[PDB]
Enzyme design. Structure first.
Site, PDB file in Angstrom:
ATOM      1  N   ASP A  36       0.801  -1.241   0.000  1.00 48.67           N
ATOM      2  CA  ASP A  36       0.000   0.000   0.000  1.00 48.67           C
ATOM      3  C   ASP A  36       0.828   1.282   0.000  1.00 48.67           C
ATOM      4  O   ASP A  36       1.250   1.751   1.052  1.00 48.67           O
ATOM      5  CB  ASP A  36      -0.939  -0.012   1.212  1.00 48.67           C
ATOM      6  CG  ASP A  36      -1.966   1.112   1.173  1.00 48.67           C
ATOM      7  OD1 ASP A  36      -2.101   1.797   0.139  1.00 48.67           O
ATOM      8  OD2 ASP A  36      -2.654   1.291   2.196  1.00 48.67           O
ATOM      9  N   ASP A 232      -1.087   5.520  -5.684  1.00 50.73           N
ATOM     10  CA  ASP A 232      -1.628   4.663  -4.589  1.00 50.73           C
ATOM     11  C   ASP A 232      -1.912   3.231  -4.998  1.00 50.73           C
ATOM     12  O   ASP A 232      -2.961   2.933  -5.581  1.00 50.73           O
ATOM     13  CB  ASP A 232      -2.908   5.299  -4.007  1.00 50.73           C
ATOM     14  CG  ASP A 232      -3.431   4.525  -2.803  1.00 50.73           C
ATOM     15  OD1 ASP A 232      -2.725   3.616  -2.293  1.00 50.73           O
ATOM     16  OD2 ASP A 232      -4.555   4.837  -2.342  1.00 50.73           O
TER      17      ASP A 232
HETATM   18  N1  LIG Z   1      -4.449   3.183  -0.102  1.00 55.81           N
HETATM   19  C1  LIG Z   1      -5.407   2.708   0.682  1.00 55.81           C
HETATM   20  N2  LIG Z   1      -5.233   1.820   1.657  1.00 55.81           N
HETATM   21  C2  LIG Z   1      -6.420   1.771   2.481  1.00 55.81           C
HETATM   22  C3  LIG Z   1      -7.013   0.352   2.468  1.00 55.81           C
HETATM   23  C4  LIG Z   1      -7.408  -0.320   3.653  1.00 55.81           C
HETATM   24  C5  LIG Z   1      -7.971  -1.618   3.588  1.00 55.81           C
HETATM   25  C6  LIG Z   1      -8.161  -2.268   2.346  1.00 55.81           C
HETATM   26  C7  LIG Z   1      -7.771  -1.607   1.153  1.00 55.81           C
HETATM   27  C8  LIG Z   1      -7.973  -2.159  -0.132  1.00 55.81           C
HETATM   28  C9  LIG Z   1      -9.153  -2.887  -0.433  1.00 55.81           C
HETATM   29  N3  LIG Z   1      -9.407  -3.379  -1.669  1.00 55.81           N
HETATM   30  C10 LIG Z   1      -8.541  -3.151  -2.679  1.00 55.81           C
HETATM   31  C11 LIG Z   1      -7.353  -2.409  -2.483  1.00 55.81           C
HETATM   32 CL1  LIG Z   1      -6.297  -2.134  -3.802  1.00 55.81          CL
HETATM   33  C12 LIG Z   1      -7.066  -1.902  -1.194  1.00 55.81           C
HETATM   34  C13 LIG Z   1      -7.205  -0.306   1.228  1.00 55.81           C
HETATM   35  C14 LIG Z   1      -5.933   2.271   3.865  1.00 55.81           C
HETATM   36  C15 LIG Z   1      -5.714   3.808   3.875  1.00 55.81           C
HETATM   37  C16 LIG Z   1      -6.961   4.599   3.404  1.00 55.81           C
HETATM   38  C17 LIG Z   1      -8.012   3.818   2.588  1.00 55.81           C
HETATM   39  C18 LIG Z   1      -7.424   2.683   1.722  1.00 55.81           C
HETATM   40  O1  LIG Z   1      -6.607   3.340   0.723  1.00 55.81           O
END
Ligand SMILES: NC1=N[C@@]2(c3cccc(-c4cncc(Cl)c4)c3)CCCC[C@H]2O1
Ligand code: NI
Length: 402
Positions: A36, A232
């Site tokens: 991430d 991202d």
């Molecule tokens: N950058 C990014 N990471 C996450 C997050 C959290 C949990 C799951 C995901 C996720 C779920 N499905 C697909 C993807 Cl690619 C990520 C993302 C955490 C920070 C803010 C919101 C999301 O944006």
């Protein structure tokens, strides 16, 4: 110039994020961890959950140290919380090093883990500024660089799927490479172009121009970066600020007008289908984002195809057909260059030089008529500043930074 042991070290299910295998603890406990670049915490499920096959067992690690401090992390669509500590961490299909890193042991969550995604934690690769609870919690990559001789850079090749699809009962499998500490030349073709990291928090960049099928959207360029633009890997879609999203959809609708799709499609809430192998790709336009260059007044463009922004989904009831989700969506938190953008390119997160590199990915999905492209330079005589300055809250202003 080779990094063979790290090639193909990413896996995932389409739309559910790319993960890398990591080990935590002594002896090493194996976990799959979402890669991430849009967050800055290393956080792993550390208790039973319906969607977890396994989790980090702190009690089983001889090298685990408790930091005696909790952390609470709410997002827009979910939340997690847990206990902070440190332990030994390695990436089996990564550099041959082991590091002591901060680990948030997730004890409770809501709408965070995803059924069948096959990952159990998140590896935040962005900067300390956006770490929780605060910027004193050193992110994983910072620890890796400080403790080892690994160069301060990583690169990502995300490879999307993939019609015809293997399966009807499960989502399509995806693959990719995270090269830690360098650049693997077999992962790209042509020129590598760099855009400045505007500020080290997210991987923030500046978009100076947008075209849809070579047609300029002709908006004030600050609109493209309202309130930021970021790269991202933890977002599936290309997300665009409301005004930009509306202009883009209007333009894409116009190009594809021979086909009248329901409004639900443009909202990403409904699939559209064609009979197997007959998808009229040529009615959908290419989209070009011009990014600020390293030189004043220069830019370069990254151009993606409908094969990037129309995501394949194999529906069981109509496996006769090739069906697609529209993966450009509205944002209220700025532009997000997610997997829709990244699957076109090899992306170099050159932290050492405060820049992000793009080159055409050796694995991007294309046809015989058009390709994803990275092209430049483009020069503009009198350049506006296209960056947006986020209004400063008293909250944020009051912080001290010792
Ligand atoms: N950058 C990014 N990471 C996450 C997050 C959290 C949990 C799951 C995901 C996720 C779920 N499905 C697909 C993807 Cl690619 C990520 C993302 C955490 C920070 C803010 C919101 C999301 O944006
Ligand atoms: Ni002070």
């Amino acid at each position: 110039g080779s990094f063979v042991e790290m090639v193909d070290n990413l896996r995932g299910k389409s739309g559910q994020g790319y993960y890398v295998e990591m080990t935590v603890g002594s002896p090493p406990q194996t976990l799959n961890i979402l890669v991430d670049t849009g967050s800055s915490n290393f956080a792993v499920g550390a208790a039973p959950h319906p969607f977890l096959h396994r989790y980090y067992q702190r009690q089983l690690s001889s090298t685990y140290r408790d930091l005696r401090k909790g952390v609470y992390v709410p997002y827009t669509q979910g939340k997690w919380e847990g206990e902070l500590g440190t332990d030994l961490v390695s990436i089996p299909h990564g550099p041959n090093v082991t590091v002591r890193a901060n680990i948030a042991a997730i004890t409770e969550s809501d709408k965070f883990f995803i059924n069948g995604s096959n990952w159990e934690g998140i590896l935040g690769l962005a900067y300390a500024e956006i770490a929780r609870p605060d910027d004193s919690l050193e992110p994983f990559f910072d620890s890796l660089v400080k403790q080892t001789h690994v160069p301060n850079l990583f690169s990502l090749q995300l490879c999307g799927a993939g019609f015809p699809l293997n399966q009807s009962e499960v989502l399509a499998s995806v693959g990719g490479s995270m090269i830690i500490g360098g650049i693997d030349h077999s992962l790209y073709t042509g020129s590598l172009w760099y855009t400045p990291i505007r500020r080290e928090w997210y991987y923030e960049v500046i978009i100076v121009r947008v075209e849809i099928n070579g047609q300029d959207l002709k908006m004030d360029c600050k609109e493209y970066n309202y309130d930021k633009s970021i790269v991202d890997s933890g977002t599936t879609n290309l997300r665009l600020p409301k005004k930009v999203f509306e202009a883009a959809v209007k333009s894409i609708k116009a190009a594809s007008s021979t086909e009248k799709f329901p409004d639900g499609f443009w909202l990403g809430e409904q699939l559209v289908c064609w009979q197997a192998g007959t998808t009229p790709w040529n009615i959908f336009p290419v989209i070009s984002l011009y990014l600020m260059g390293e030189v004043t007044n220069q830019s370069f463009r990254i151009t993606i195809l409908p094969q990037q922004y129309l995501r394949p989904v194999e529906d069981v009831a109509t496996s006769q057909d090739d069906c697609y989700k529209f993966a450009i969506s509205q944002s209220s938190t700025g532009t997000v260059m997610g997997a829709v953008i990244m699957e076109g390119f090899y992306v170099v997160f050159d932290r050492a030089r405060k820049r992000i590199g793009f080159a055409v990915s050796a694995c991007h999905v294309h046809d015989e008529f058009r390709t994803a492209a990275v092209e430049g330079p483009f020069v503009t005589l009198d350049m506006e500043d296209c960056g947006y300055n986020i209004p400063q809250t008293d909250e944020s202003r009051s912080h001290h930074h010792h």
